[PDB]
Amino acid sequence: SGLVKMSAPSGAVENCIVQVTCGSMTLNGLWLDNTVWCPRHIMCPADQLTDPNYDALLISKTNHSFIVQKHIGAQANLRVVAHSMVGVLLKLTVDVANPSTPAYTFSTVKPGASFSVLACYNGKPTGVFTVNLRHNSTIKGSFLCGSCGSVGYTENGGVINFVYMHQMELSNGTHTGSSFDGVMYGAFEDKQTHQLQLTDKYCTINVVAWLYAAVLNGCKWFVKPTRVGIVTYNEWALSNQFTEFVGTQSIDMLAHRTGVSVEQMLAAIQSLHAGFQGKTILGQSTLEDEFTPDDVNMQVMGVVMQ
Amino acid sequence: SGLVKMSAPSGAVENCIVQVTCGSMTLNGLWLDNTVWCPRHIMCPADQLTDPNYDALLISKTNHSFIVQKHIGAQANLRVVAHSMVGVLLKLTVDVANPSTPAYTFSTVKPGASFSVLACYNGKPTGVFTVNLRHNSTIKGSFLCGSCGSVGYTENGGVINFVYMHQMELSNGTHTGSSFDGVMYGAFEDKQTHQLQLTDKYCTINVVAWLYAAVLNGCKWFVKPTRVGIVTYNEWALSNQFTEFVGTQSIDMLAHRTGVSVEQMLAAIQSLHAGFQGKTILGQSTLEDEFTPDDVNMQVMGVVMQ
Ligand SMILES: O=C(Nc1ccc(N(Cc2ccsc2)C(=O)Cn2nnc3ccccc32)cc1)c1ccccc1
Numbered sequence: 138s139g140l141v142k143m144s145a146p147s148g149a150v151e152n153c154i155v156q157v158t159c160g161s162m163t164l165n166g167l168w169l170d171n172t173v174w175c176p177r178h179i180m181c182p183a184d185q186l187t188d189p190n191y192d193a194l195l196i197s198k199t200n201h202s203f204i205v206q207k208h209i210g211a212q213a214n215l216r217v218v219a220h221s222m223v224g225v226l227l228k229l230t231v232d233v234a235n236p237s238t239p240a241y242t243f244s245t246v247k248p249g250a251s252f253s254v255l256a257c258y259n260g261k262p263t264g265v266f267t268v269n270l271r272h273n274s275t276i277k278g279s280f281l282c283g284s285c286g287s288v289g290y291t292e293n294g295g296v297i298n299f300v301y302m303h304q305m306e307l308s309n310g311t312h313t314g315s316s317f318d319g320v321m322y323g324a325f326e327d328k329q330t331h332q333l334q335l336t337d338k339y340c341t342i343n344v345v346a347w348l349y350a351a352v353l354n355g356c357k358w359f360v361k362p363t364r365v366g367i368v369t370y371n372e373w374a375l376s377n378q379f380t381e382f383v384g385t386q387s388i389d390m391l392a393h394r395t396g397v398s399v400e401q402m403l404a405a406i407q408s409l410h411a412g413f414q415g416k417t418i419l420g421q422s423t424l425e426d427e428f429t430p431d432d433v434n435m436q437v438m439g440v441v442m443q
Numbered sequence: 444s445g446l447v448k449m450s451a452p453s454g455a456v457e458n459c460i461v462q463v464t465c466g467s468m469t470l471n472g473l474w475l476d477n478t479v480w481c482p483r484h485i486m487c488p489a490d491q492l493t494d495p496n497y498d499a500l501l502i503s504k505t506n507h508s509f510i511v512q513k514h515i516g517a518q519a520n521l522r523v524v525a526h527s528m529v530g531v532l533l534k535l536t537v538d539v540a541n542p543s544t545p546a547y548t549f550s551t552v553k554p555g556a557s558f559s560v561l562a563c564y565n566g567k568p569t570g571v572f573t574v575n576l577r578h579n580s581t582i583k584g585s586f587l588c589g590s591c592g593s594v595g596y597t598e599n600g601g602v603i604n605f606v607y608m609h610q611m612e613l614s615n616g617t618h619t620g621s622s623f624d625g626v627m628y629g630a631f632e633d634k635q636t637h638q639l640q641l642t643d644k645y646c647t648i649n650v651v652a653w654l655y656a657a658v659l660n661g662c663k664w665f666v667k668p669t670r671v672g673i674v675t676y677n678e679w680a681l682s683n684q685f686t687e688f689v690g691t692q693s694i695d696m697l698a699h700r701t702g703v704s705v706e707q708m709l710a711a712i713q714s715l716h717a718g719f720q721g722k723t724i725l726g727q728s729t730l731e732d733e734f735t736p737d738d739v740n741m742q743v744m745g746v747v748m749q
């Protein structure tokens with residue numbers, strides 16, 4: 138038992154991290170087969186950060202402009218033989234395939250989805266943590282400018298699913314990046330201008346999963362006979378910065394295991410949002426919305442007890 | 444900017460995880476050079492878990508009693524050629540040295556220290572997370588029964604420092620294990636009996652470090668001119684389940700960078716302990732005490748807030 142933020146083991150991703158340098162700027166890249174991916178803003182000189190013309194920047198560079206180095210493991214300097222833009226990514230073709238390329242896929246995750254982040258600095262892995270794609274398609278991470286190129290991923294049956302490359306800090310502790318098709322998560326441009334974020338929202342179904350985790354972990358004081366219909370909850374959610382609830386099979390099975398109904402949990406959310414009354418749930422006095430039902434499922438399998 | 448629970452990258456440790464089976468019990472082991480470590484309760488029949496005779500169990504086992512397999516990466520079946528007891532651990536000697544043994548050390552951490560955990564199941568790494576050794580030398584982690592043998596570690600300069608091997612769950616969300624000298628953390632025996640947990644406390648210096656991280660991230664509402672001397676706080680701490688504050692250079696450094704004195708932070712603690720007044724710090728409405736000063740140092744290095 139217990140519930141903690143858990144990341145996928147990072148070894149397979151660590152073997153793919155490299156350092157990329159262009160002019161005075163350096164950050165991290167991801168080396169898969171004969172390709173190195175990094176943010177295109179590596180090309181931008183410090184004085185043009187507000188107004189980058191990436192098309193001009195691209196063609197002002199030669200292949201030799203980009204120095205690519207592998208520092209950890211089987212150390213190497215990698216010759217760049219082509220460079221092109223893929224949305225807000227630079228795609229550097231190099232003359233050697235990464236022999237440690239894992240089986241992999243690319244995906245774009247949806248708000249409410251969790252993934253692991255390998256934080257990197259100067260081409261070396263430095264930390265691992267998990268985030269959730271926020272309703273406004275930001276993430277709440279921990280980064281420096283030198284951490285750009287850090288990689289978000291999930292893992293399933295030996296296959297690494299690459300979903301995020303770190304691009305920018307939008308505001309304090311608020312970050313965004315692109316999927317590997319080069320599309321930036323959310324309504325955000327890779328430039329150094331104030332950009333307004335859409336309002337964030339609690340991910341209801343994640344909150345519900347977390348409350349079920351709590352109940353399986355013996356924490357149940359918040360469960361009452363009180364029920365709220367999904368239609369009534371969703372109307373309330375629109376006025377209180379929660380997402381609308383749509384049930385899933387995974388939630389249904391958690392309800393089955395605990396004997397606590399979805400309508401009870403939605404009622405608990407409404408009460409708890411008004412206040413925790415000096416009490417805690419799984420160590421917290423705020424609603425937790427970054428565990429998905431799948432994340433919870435992985436960490437439970439106890440019999441409901443009490 | 445941003446502050447998240449960060450773990451050390453796990454790849455170096457992943458290469459050392461194996462599966463160990465004895466009779467019908469299987470769990471995880473750590474393979475370094477020609478040695479495999481695992482909890483000694485792998486020898487115990489299900490029906491003797493209340494009062495195992497580990498010395499008699501050891502004698503009844505042969506080297507052939509133990510099946511060790513590497514299931515990930517370079518797969519292997521490892522032949523056991525010796526077995527001996529090391530406190531609450533078994534030390535198996537195998538006939539093949541792990542070719543991927545990292546530079547490593549062993550140490551035993553003190554209450555208030557953080558370390559990373561690679562959760563494993565049937566000899567396969569499954570997840571990474573960070574814990575803090577509690578005041579009663581338990582940890583608040585996330586483990587299932589097949590997770591025994593999972594490994595706790597830190598990184599120090601390309602050296603893996605192994606500090607924990609998971610042994611048991613004491614109560615919901617409460618765990619302990621041993622260092623690799625085979626000494627169990629805390630007052631706990633490796634038998635299936637209810638054991639008394641000494642009362643936990645808030646680690647004051649960690650809470651202080653967390654408050655400093657908040658200020659460095661532009662969260663400052665809790666800072667007042669109010670001060671409380673160290674000697675006075677410590678008197679207060681004894682009656683309110685906080686550890687005594689002893690100053691360190693790391694904390695002094697944070698105080699200097701933020702211009703907020705330790706005494707102001709201890710005052711904030713006394714106040715926040717009474718209640719957060721409907722406000723939040725770094726997203727939370729409870730005092731966070733599992734970030735060490737060094738954990739915080741590594742995630743800060745932005746420049747001046749007001
Ligand atoms: O510093 C340099 N470049 C740079 C690049 C990107 C950013 N932006 C905004 C942006 C995106 C596209 S254009 C501008 C971030 O959000 C970088 N970033 N990303 N995560 C960060 C966390 C903390 C601080 C900064 C962080 C800022 C600066 C530099 C250094 C030497 C030579 C040339 C350039």
Ligand SMILES: O=C(Nc1ccc(N(Cc2ccsc2)C(=O)Cn2nnc3ccccc32)cc1)c1ccccc1
Pocket residue numbers: 138467468469484487488489492493586587588589590591610611612613632633634635
């Ligand atoms: O299940 C078996 N053994 C076993 C071993 C240890 C434990 N204990 C307690 C303990 C310690 C020393 S002796 C007894 C835990 O705390 C295991 N543990 N460790 N972390 C856990 C999290 C959730 C549930 C259980 C967890 C429980 C059972 C088994 C299965 C087949 C054949 C023989 C034995």
